[PDB]
CSV table of C-alpha atoms in Angstrom, one decimal:
chain,number,residue,atom,x,y,z
A,891,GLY,CA,26.6,-4.5,-36.3
A,892,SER,CA,23.6,-6.9,-36.3
A,893,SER,CA,20.4,-6.4,-38.4
A,894,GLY,CA,18.4,-8.7,-40.6
A,895,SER,CA,15.2,-6.9,-41.6
A,896,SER,CA,14.2,-4.0,-43.9
A,897,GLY,CA,11.1,-2.2,-45.0
A,898,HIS,CA,9.4,-3.0,-41.7
A,899,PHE,CA,9.2,-1.3,-38.3
A,900,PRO,CA,8.4,-4.1,-35.8
A,901,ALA,CA,7.3,-2.4,-32.6
A,902,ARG,CA,5.5,-5.3,-30.9
A,903,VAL,CA,6.5,-5.9,-27.3
A,904,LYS,CA,4.8,-7.0,-24.1
A,905,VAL,CA,5.1,-4.9,-21.0
A,906,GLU,CA,5.5,-6.8,-17.7
A,907,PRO,CA,3.7,-5.5,-14.6
A,908,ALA,CA,5.9,-3.7,-12.1
A,909,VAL,CA,3.3,-4.1,-9.3
A,910,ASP,CA,1.6,-6.9,-7.4
A,911,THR,CA,-1.8,-5.4,-6.6
A,912,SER,CA,-3.0,-9.0,-6.0
A,913,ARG,CA,-3.7,-8.6,-2.3
A,914,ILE,CA,-5.9,-5.5,-2.6
A,915,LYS,CA,-9.0,-5.4,-0.4
A,916,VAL,CA,-11.8,-2.9,-0.9
A,917,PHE,CA,-14.5,-2.4,1.8
A,918,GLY,CA,-17.5,-0.1,1.8
A,919,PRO,CA,-21.0,0.6,0.5
A,920,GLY,CA,-19.7,2.3,-2.7
A,921,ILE,CA,-18.3,-1.1,-3.7
A,922,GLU,CA,-20.7,-3.4,-1.8
A,923,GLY,CA,-24.0,-1.7,-2.8
A,924,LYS,CA,-25.5,-0.6,0.5
A,925,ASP,CA,-26.0,3.1,0.5
A,926,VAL,CA,-25.2,3.5,-3.2
A,927,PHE,CA,-28.8,4.4,-3.9
A,928,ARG,CA,-29.5,6.7,-6.9
A,929,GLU,CA,-28.4,10.3,-6.3
A,930,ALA,CA,-26.6,9.2,-3.1
A,931,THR,CA,-23.1,10.0,-1.8
A,932,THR,CA,-21.3,6.6,-1.6
A,933,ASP,CA,-17.6,5.8,-1.3
A,934,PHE,CA,-15.4,2.8,-0.6
A,935,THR,CA,-12.0,2.2,0.9
A,936,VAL,CA,-9.0,0.6,-0.7
A,937,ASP,CA,-6.4,-0.9,1.7
A,938,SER,CA,-3.0,-1.6,0.2
A,939,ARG,CA,0.2,-2.6,2.0
A,940,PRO,CA,2.8,-3.6,-0.6
A,941,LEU,CA,1.3,-0.9,-2.8
A,942,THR,CA,1.4,2.1,-0.4
A,943,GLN,CA,2.2,3.0,3.2
A,944,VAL,CA,1.5,6.7,3.3
A,945,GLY,CA,-1.1,7.1,0.6
A,946,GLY,CA,-0.5,7.7,-3.0
A,947,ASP,CA,-1.8,9.3,-6.3
A,948,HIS,CA,-1.7,6.2,-8.6
A,949,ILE,CA,-5.4,5.2,-8.2
A,950,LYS,CA,-8.2,5.6,-10.7
A,951,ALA,CA,-11.7,4.2,-11.2
A,952,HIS,CA,-14.4,4.3,-13.8
A,953,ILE,CA,-18.1,3.5,-13.2
A,954,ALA,CA,-20.2,2.2,-16.1
A,955,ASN,CA,-24.0,2.5,-15.8
A,956,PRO,CA,-26.2,-0.3,-17.2
A,957,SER,CA,-27.5,2.2,-19.8
A,958,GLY,CA,-24.1,3.3,-21.1
A,959,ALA,CA,-23.4,6.5,-19.1
A,960,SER,CA,-20.6,6.7,-16.5
A,961,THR,CA,-20.5,8.2,-13.0
A,962,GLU,CA,-17.6,10.5,-12.3
A,963,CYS,CA,-15.3,9.0,-9.6
A,964,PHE,CA,-13.5,11.1,-7.0
A,965,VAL,CA,-10.5,9.4,-5.4
A,966,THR,CA,-9.3,10.7,-2.1
A,967,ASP,CA,-6.0,9.5,-0.5
A,968,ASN,CA,-6.0,9.7,3.3
A,969,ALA,CA,-2.2,10.0,3.1
A,970,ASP,CA,-2.1,7.1,5.4
A,971,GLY,CA,-2.1,4.0,3.2
A,972,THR,CA,-5.7,3.6,2.1
A,973,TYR,CA,-7.8,5.3,-0.7
A,974,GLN,CA,-11.3,6.7,-0.4
A,975,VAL,CA,-13.2,7.0,-3.7
A,976,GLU,CA,-16.6,8.8,-3.6
A,977,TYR,CA,-19.1,8.9,-6.4
A,978,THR,CA,-22.8,9.6,-6.9
A,979,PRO,CA,-24.6,7.3,-9.3
A,980,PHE,CA,-27.4,9.1,-11.2
A,981,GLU,CA,-28.9,5.7,-12.2
A,982,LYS,CA,-30.4,2.9,-10.1
A,983,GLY,CA,-28.8,-0.2,-11.6
A,984,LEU,CA,-25.8,-2.5,-11.7
A,985,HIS,CA,-22.6,-0.6,-12.9
A,986,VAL,CA,-19.2,-2.0,-13.8
A,987,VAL,CA,-16.4,-0.4,-11.8
A,988,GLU,CA,-12.9,-1.0,-13.3
A,989,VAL,CA,-10.0,-0.3,-10.9
A,990,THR,CA,-6.4,-0.1,-12.1
A,991,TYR,CA,-3.4,0.4,-9.8
A,992,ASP,CA,-0.4,1.8,-11.7
A,993,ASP,CA,-1.8,0.8,-15.1
A,994,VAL,CA,-2.6,-2.7,-13.7
A,995,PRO,CA,-6.1,-4.2,-12.9
A,996,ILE,CA,-6.8,-5.9,-9.6
A,997,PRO,CA,-8.0,-9.5,-9.1
A,998,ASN,CA,-11.1,-8.0,-7.6
A,999,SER,CA,-12.2,-6.1,-10.6
A,1000,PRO,CA,-14.2,-5.5,-12.5
A,1001,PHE,CA,-16.7,-4.9,-9.7
A,1002,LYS,CA,-20.5,-5.0,-9.7
A,1003,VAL,CA,-22.5,-2.5,-7.7
A,1004,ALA,CA,-26.2,-3.2,-7.8
A,1005,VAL,CA,-28.0,0.0,-6.8
A,1006,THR,CA,-31.4,-0.2,-5.1
A,1007,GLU,CA,-34.3,2.3,-4.8
A,1008,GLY,CA,-33.7,4.1,-1.6
A,1009,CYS,CA,-34.5,7.8,-1.2
A,1010,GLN,CA,-34.0,11.2,-2.8
A,1011,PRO,CA,-31.9,14.1,-1.6
A,1012,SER,CA,-34.7,16.4,-2.7
A,1013,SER,CA,-34.4,19.6,-0.6
A,1014,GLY,CA,-37.4,20.7,1.4
A,1015,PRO,CA,-37.9,20.5,5.2
A,1016,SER,CA,-35.0,22.2,7.1
A,1017,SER,CA,-33.9,21.4,10.7
A,1018,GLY,CA,-32.5,24.8,11.6
């Protein structure tokens, strides 16, 4: 028996990271800011070695518009080792994308995607 404290429930403890996620590389317009124009379908690719080899379901992102709103993110694992997240920003501006692998942020985030005035998907002239 060992106890020297009463009338107090000390539940303060730090949780150590069980993942590296320090060598994660993300390439694509969705993260660079090329075809991420407003109302445009843009997506990036997350290559991870020591994190996954045959794709996984432990990825999650969150876009933050410069106004306050947020663009829904759609992560798609190619069941090969890399992740493909697609999102359509309904606002032309710099958003803050926060990535977290297994409840752990990467040394690349937060990210900054500066959208530029491009074109509109407005439906009109059809090809066939």
